[PDB]
Amino acid sequence: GVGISTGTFNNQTEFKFLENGWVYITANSSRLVHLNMPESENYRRVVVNNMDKTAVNGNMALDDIHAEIVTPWSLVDANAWGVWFNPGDWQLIVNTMSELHLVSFEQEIFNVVLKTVSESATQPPTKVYNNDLTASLMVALDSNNTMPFTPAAMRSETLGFYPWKPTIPTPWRYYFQWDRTLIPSHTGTSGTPTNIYHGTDPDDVQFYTIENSVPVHLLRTGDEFATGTFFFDCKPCRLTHTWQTNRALGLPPFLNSLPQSEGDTNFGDIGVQQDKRRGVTQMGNTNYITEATIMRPAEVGYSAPYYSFEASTQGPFKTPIAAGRGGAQTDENQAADGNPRYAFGRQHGQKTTTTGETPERFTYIAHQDTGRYPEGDWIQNINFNLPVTNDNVLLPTDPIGGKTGINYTNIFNTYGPLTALNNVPPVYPNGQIWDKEFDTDLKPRLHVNAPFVCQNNCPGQLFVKVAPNLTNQYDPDASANMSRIVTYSDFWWKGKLVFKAKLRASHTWNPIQQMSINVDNQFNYVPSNIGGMKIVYEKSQLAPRKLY
Amino acid sequence: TIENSVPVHLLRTGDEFATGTFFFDCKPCRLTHTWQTNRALGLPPFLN
């Protein structure tokens, strides 16, 4: 079987329009993957300890210590938008559809190849690559999800984003329990705080091996591996955004006085004393019915502490925020809303002809207004009594704990039974698509890394590796790691991701926002005279929708 | 008052009281523990 192909390369995106404005979107993607043999054939238990950085008072946030198990296997991950759609497809989806559903997924490996490097050490010296028609590529598909879930998108180590550029997988490794203590401090702080790595707790040790828990497949050149189809069980994702905040819900006040001259500087007027109006309020001790005072059904969005690090058994970590963008973009407070920032390079969006190790990056700012503008907040004594007196107001300007740079908004939290929020929006092309759910008794209401969370089981991970190619002399009783013939593999990967979407219709007299090419961005969607490419990020929920 | 809201049974030496069977409707309880904190979720950083 050494002389014939076992597959077809396919990277077409098909749109199947069904009855009732429902679209069937089939995303074919295939790639050439290159794989080298492991540096070592054993599992290593390694600890990282950058105490040199955190030993400097006021550097707590740069903590990198952890323990991980380094495995001799590689992970083939394709969970990122860029792997399946090009800017052309994204425009069609984002401008036309109103919601997206994740249906099924499947992959395949074919046309496997294993070559061997012959070191013609002489003259230059030279190298020679020869096919080893009996060598084997090892393939393991963790279908029961025994292994820990490690989504490569998190560290931008997913499959490349160009159908015509070869790619590679990432070495697989997972976390291993450890106990760590780090006490906070600042520049002034005297002495040394407490920076200790206690070790490992016995009741939390879990050493996993692929050999012991998954059936391994041996593929030779004439072999091919296919996965069945997997059907997702997730909630639909909306491609629309809400714009109403608590201030724009319900019946506005009737204006007894209207403008008589064109110009947005000629205002209308309610025309009724603020303390003589009618309506409902949740302030029992006053008669002022203001647009900031009148009652609204519940609350859109919430306030959370910002640049807050909490600590537990293995060190400090940032407190996540699930928020939109409340606040005119020019003003914002991306910390308060927790906008994500993405760093990546060459293989996932950064200009292909660039040089150097500095990544490319961007901070995604959503369209939905479910965020907060802290500087606008304030708290006041119940006696009310305006104008409020300095002693009856806490401003995002008054210091807390004596600190001049810390607010109350800084540790404030207004999440409660009246809180309404929206899920996270897709992020093309660097975003992760789906995510496994936490196996805790009570689950989160959403995840901040991906729009689709598998309610049942997610698709298990696919691990690949080059089987050992031994020489004439091998001795099992040898501390010093043995010898293998330098071997590497090249194989084609192919996958299919099917979504189901719904076409939108016009409902307002005015046009809506739409993605479009133009004089300015034009050259971000075409190659350079040298063949340099790049994939600029786009936004997914242009197009408003009512909230209430 | 128990007298006003429940039927009272009088048992003498030769008497006996039995309850029927009652079937609970609760979520299962796990006899396992999790050890991962926010710091041990996902793909660790590749060590060069």
Ligand SMILES: [Ca+2]
């Ligand atoms: Ca907006």
